[PDB]
Amino acid sequence: LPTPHEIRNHLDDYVIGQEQAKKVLAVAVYNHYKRLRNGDTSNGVELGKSNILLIGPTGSGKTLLAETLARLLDVPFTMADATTLTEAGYVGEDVENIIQKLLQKSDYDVQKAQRGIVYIDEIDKISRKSDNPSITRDVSGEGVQQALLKLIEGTVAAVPPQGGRKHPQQEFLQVDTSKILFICGGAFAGLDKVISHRVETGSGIGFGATVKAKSDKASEGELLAQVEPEDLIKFGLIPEFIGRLPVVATLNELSEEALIQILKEPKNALTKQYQALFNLEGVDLEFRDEALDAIAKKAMARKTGARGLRSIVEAALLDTMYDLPSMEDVEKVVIDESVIDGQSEPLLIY
Amino acid sequence: ALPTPHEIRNHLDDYVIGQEQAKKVLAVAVYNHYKRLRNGDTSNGVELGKSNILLIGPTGSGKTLLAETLARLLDVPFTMADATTLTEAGYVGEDVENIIQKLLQKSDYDVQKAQRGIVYIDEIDKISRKSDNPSITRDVSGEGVQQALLKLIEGTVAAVPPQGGRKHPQQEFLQVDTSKILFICGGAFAGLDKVISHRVETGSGIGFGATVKAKSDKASEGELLAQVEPEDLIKFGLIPEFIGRLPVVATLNELSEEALIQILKEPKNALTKQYQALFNLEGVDLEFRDEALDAIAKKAMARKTGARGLRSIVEAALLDTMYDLPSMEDVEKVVIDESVIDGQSEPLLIY
Amino acid sequence: LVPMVIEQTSRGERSFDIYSRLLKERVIFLTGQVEDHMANLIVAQMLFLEAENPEKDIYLYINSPGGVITAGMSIYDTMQFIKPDVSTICMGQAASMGAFLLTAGAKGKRFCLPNSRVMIHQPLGGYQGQATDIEIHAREILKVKGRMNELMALHTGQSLEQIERDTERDRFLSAPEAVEYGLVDSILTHRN
Amino acid sequence: LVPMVIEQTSRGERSFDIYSRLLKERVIFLTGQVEDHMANLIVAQMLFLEAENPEKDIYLYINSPGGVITAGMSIYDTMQFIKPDVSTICMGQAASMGAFLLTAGAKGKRFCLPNSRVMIHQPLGGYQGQATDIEIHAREILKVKGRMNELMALHTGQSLEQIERDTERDRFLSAPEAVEYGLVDSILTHRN
Numbered sequence A: 001l002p003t004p005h006e007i008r009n010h011l012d013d014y015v016i017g018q019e020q021a022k023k024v025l026a027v028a029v030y031n032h033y034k035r036l037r038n039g040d041t042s043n044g045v046e047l048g049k050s051n052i053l054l055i056g057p058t059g060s061g062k063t064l065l066a067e068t069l070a071r072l073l074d075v076p077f078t079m080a081d082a083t084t085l086t087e088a089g090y091v092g093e094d095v096e097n098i099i100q101k102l103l104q105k106s107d108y109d110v111q112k113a114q115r116g117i118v119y120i121d122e123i124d125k126i127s128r129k130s131d132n133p134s135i136t137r138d139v140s141g142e143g144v145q146q147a148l149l150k151l152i153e154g155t156v157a158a159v160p161p162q163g164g165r166k167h168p169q170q171e172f173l174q175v176d177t178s179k180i181l182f183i184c185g186g187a188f189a190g191l192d193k194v195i196s197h198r199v200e201t202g203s204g205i206g207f208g209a210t211v212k213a214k215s216d217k218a219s220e221g222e223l224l225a226q227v228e229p230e231d232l233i234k235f236g237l238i239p240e241f242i243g244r245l246p247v248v249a250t251l252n253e254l255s256e257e258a259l260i261q262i263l264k265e266p267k268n269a270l271t272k273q274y275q276a277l278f279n280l281e282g283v284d285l286e287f288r289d290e291a292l293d294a295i296a297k298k299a300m301a302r303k304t305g306a307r308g309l310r311s312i313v314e315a316a317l318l319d320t321m322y323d324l325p326s327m328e329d330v331e332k333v334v335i336d337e338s339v340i341d342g343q344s345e346p347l348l349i350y
Numbered sequence B: 001a002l003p004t005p006h007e008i009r010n011h012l013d014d015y016v017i018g019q020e021q022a023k024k025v026l027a028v029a030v031y032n033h034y035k036r037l038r039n040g041d042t043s044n045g046v047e048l049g050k051s052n053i054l055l056i057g058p059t060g061s062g063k064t065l066l067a068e069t070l071a072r073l074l075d076v077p078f079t080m081a082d083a084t085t086l087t088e089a090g091y092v093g094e095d096v097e098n099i100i101q102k103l104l105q106k107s108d109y110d111v112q113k114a115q116r117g118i119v120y121i122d123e124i125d126k127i128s129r130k131s132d133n134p135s136i137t138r139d140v141s142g143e144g145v146q147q148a149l150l151k152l153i154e155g156t157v158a159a160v161p162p163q164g165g166r167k168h169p170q171q172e173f174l175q176v177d178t179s180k181i182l183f184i185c186g187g188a189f190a191g192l193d194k195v196i197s198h199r200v201e202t203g204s205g206i207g208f209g210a211t212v213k214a215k216s217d218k219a220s221e222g223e224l225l226a227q228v229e230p231e232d233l234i235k236f237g238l239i240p241e242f243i244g245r246l247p248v249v250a251t252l253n254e255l256s257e258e259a260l261i262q263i264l265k266e267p268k269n270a271l272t273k274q275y276q277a278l279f280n281l282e283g284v285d286l287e288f289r290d291e292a293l294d295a296i297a298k299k300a301m302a303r304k305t306g307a308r309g310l311r312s313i314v315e316a317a318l319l320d321t322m323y324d325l326p327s328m329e330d331v332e333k334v335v336i337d338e339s340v341i342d343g344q345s346e347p348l349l350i351y
Numbered sequence C, D: 001l002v003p004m005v006i007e008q009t010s011r012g013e014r015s016f017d018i019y020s021r022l023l024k025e026r027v028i029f030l031t032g033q034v035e036d037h038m039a040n041l042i043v044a045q046m047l048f049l050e051a052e053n054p055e056k057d058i059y060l061y062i063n064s065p066g067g068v069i070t071a072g073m074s075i076y077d078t079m080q081f082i083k084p085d086v087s088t089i090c091m092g093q094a095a096s097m098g099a100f101l102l103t104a105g106a107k108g109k110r111f112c113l114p115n116s117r118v119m120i121h122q123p124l125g126g127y128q129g130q131a132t133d134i135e136i137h138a139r140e141i142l143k144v145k146g147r148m149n150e151l152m153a154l155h156t157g158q159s160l161e162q163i164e165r166d167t168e169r170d171r172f173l174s175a176p177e178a179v180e181y182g183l184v185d186s187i188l189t190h191r192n
């Protein structure tokens, strides 16, 4: 029902630098509910299902997109983690409990429950692995993918009645999983290697050949976009599972400009967090526009996405924070470009 | 009142010698954690975020000692864990959620105190992968453990038995958010120095333009570790997501000969004081010459065991004396000399 | 006979000749009389190393009494063409062609050993035949003399006139004298 | 024909030529007339061992009748540049260049067999051409003679004047006589 522009506008407020990924999610979710509104498919042809795969690097807003999307949509939104999921009958967990969690959010209403969405974080972690002699059995792996795949194909899942008595009572509330959007998001670390090995032309040796230096070899951006089902199978994913997820939203590592906005534009930005911390001590914190550029540059080198920003701030402010409480008559502290490099010390106003 | 970092550092200085950088990071983290607890996020629109610390350091450098000393002055509940015991979900070994159960015991079933608590995870390097590749076979004690900690570090509700875990429908597991639970992961990443040297040092060839150090002028482990970056940890085996959860990185330095000498007498719980008390209760006084302490430091450094090496030297030097000392009579004082450490001369005794 | 050495890598032990092992470390040996066949071999090594790592610097050990000019130009053009900087080291001696290649190295990376002996002379050639043909070949070699001197002046930094005066007759320059002339930048006395 | 020997290692048995097997133990063989080709081979062997272990001492057996000066200087400069101490040994004989390299070894690690014969002489050379060119080439050999005598005095410890007088003509020195002169430090009569 919500227009894609409305969905993109809401995500843009909380997500920065993922315009391409946001477009796919808005279009995909809009088409999904649109199909649910109509019935019989309006023709013999079968309208392909919309299942998104949020593949992206660390700190790229994969979890943020799913969490912020739930706020806009009134439909029930549940979040699960593949790490906890295990084969049925084991101490770890059961995949069927995911449906029960969705009901609790929607008050067990089968009608509205079918219109809910699911976000399975850390999906790559359960990638298929070879057998280990020491381990008794591989509970996590392809076995968990089969249970999740069954829900995508469309199957009714029995749910206990709000924690019924010892006697089962055979309520087994049924909820179809064909119309339930199944979003699976994970950061496939190491996938770049297999993708590069397949699309790498190679460097020639002759005078007229093209030499490829390590500087311009490749990057995570523009490489994951060429992902295909065959490379994902090598990672360990089941081919049937990949086929059931036609929509693929690939994120790119945040740029210097994008990181600069995150430092100040969000309400819960890192800079605002420290400003409030210093304010609790009776001092005000000010960040110069030039300092933000250096912090973004250092964070990009760390390759930890947004989380890298906190490392730079904590390191630069480690010395001042240690001595600032013991110090007196200091009312204002300022940080500049020189402080980020480390050659200079944080400026103090008395 | 609110203790300042300097006051907190003074306590650490009493028990830890030479790890000035680790004390500053630990003191600042406790100060910020206390401030967040003092004024909750509900007070203003801003939602303050925590910063986890990664205590990298060689053996016997004081990593574990800092955690023990920290608990002495931490009014907030604190607990220590072992990464080796932890295993991924679905296996008989252990579960990451057990860590929260241990912390909940200290708070006497107080969810509020447990949520705003500090946790220490020693031997975090043990669960590191072997190479940059994810894995070849399922790793119950390895990346799998790191994969389960991601939700715990960032923050997720943890199910734990309320009291006794019995007679309760569905076990009535308590849900405690771990978003505010500071996590300090200290480990001795053995072999990380060579990884850093690979990128830091270049030109290792055979020709005249190559770089040859002869193993004497090469950078030490402490110097190499100080230049550690996240990319280096990827090759060592740490998951990229796990590193992001730990922005702050603290590097401890190798104990020098001078630092070891101070540890023998300066700290509250020193090696010399330990043996001295052993003699005091038996009716003997133990005296160590200043030169003797210096000699012990040199021998201990060669062992490569850090502070623990000092115990080995003292035990061997006093091996014979302790064996025959109880049989001896009229023993009121003993003195150790530099020659005693070398073994040329028997330690002096006062009859 | 050439001795063989064993290289230990994660893949396993590998056996290389003493020259190939150094080639793996971006080291090319220029030894003996310069000619068409040896020059093509050096050219193939420069191109091969360029592909492996076009950023790292290549090393060239020059110990030769000189040779053909045409063969040397193939090496000189190859060095300037490829992106990697070529470091030239003089061992034992470096005659006219060896010196031209020595000074042709990357600015700042040209080295020479203390007891090395450098010699620079003008090109020498000869032709037998009709007077008309002699005028052609005589004009061609003069062009090479001027062209070679123009390039030497650029690397050494000396004026073209100065190069012409010194190259008129065989001139021997020691390692310290070469530094002043501009053929090389520094001397490698001891490992630091 | 060089024989092949088997070396037993943890990984397994490996086949090595007699010369390569000894190279693994930091042993370099100098044999025959010195020249640019064999010199570059020795230089590569020296640099290779330096990378493997720059602390361990290298050994250089010298059994040669002499040769080109320039090729020898490449070996001499290489031995002094690298950090490892080069222990020179004299087997059979050591002529002008063999002796200059022999005495160039690290102080206290120069040896010679009891029946070895050492010989030192001034450089030999010649040139044919115009008188002007003769003067140029004549001045170089004089500098080489003075430069080579200067280095011999540094290693042997004898005065420069004495080296000039003794090196004016071919002088043969037995193993014990060489110890007094300073070319070598000790004699290896039997294994202790």
Ligand SMILES: Nc1ncnc2c1ncn2[C@@H]1O[C@H](COP(=O)(O)OP(=O)(O)OP(=O)(O)O)[C@@H](O)[C@H]1O
Residues within 6 Å of the ligand: A014, A015, A016, A017, A018, A056, A057, A058, A059, A060, A061, A062, A063, A064, A065, A186, A187, A262, A305, A306, A307, B241
């Ligand atoms: N595009 C973005 N815009 C603003 N903030 C972001 C963005 N991406 C990440 N962040 C910040 O990073 C933190 C966590 O990010 P998130 O968990 O979404 O990363 P992720 O994609 O889940 O990485 P991983 O999957 O490897 O854990 C959030 O607190 C958020 O402030």
Ligand SMILES: Nc1ncnc2c1ncn2[C@@H]1O[C@H](COP(=O)(O)OP(=O)(O)OP(=O)(O)O)[C@@H](O)[C@H]1O
Residues within 6 Å of the ligand: B015, B016, B017, B018, B019, B057, B058, B059, B060, B061, B062, B063, B064, B065, B066, B187, B188, B263, B267, B269, B307, B308
């Ligand atoms: N900086 C220090 N000052 C004083 N004593 C120290 C210091 N570092 C280590 N020690 C001594 O070493 C003993 C154990 O050290 P600790 O367990 O903290 O090392 P560690 O870093 O945990 O080693 P590992 O990394 O191998 O676990 C303590 O009893 C303590 O007396």
Ligand SMILES: [Mg+2]
Residues within 6 Å of the ligand: B063, B064, B122, B123
């Ligand atoms: Mg420990």
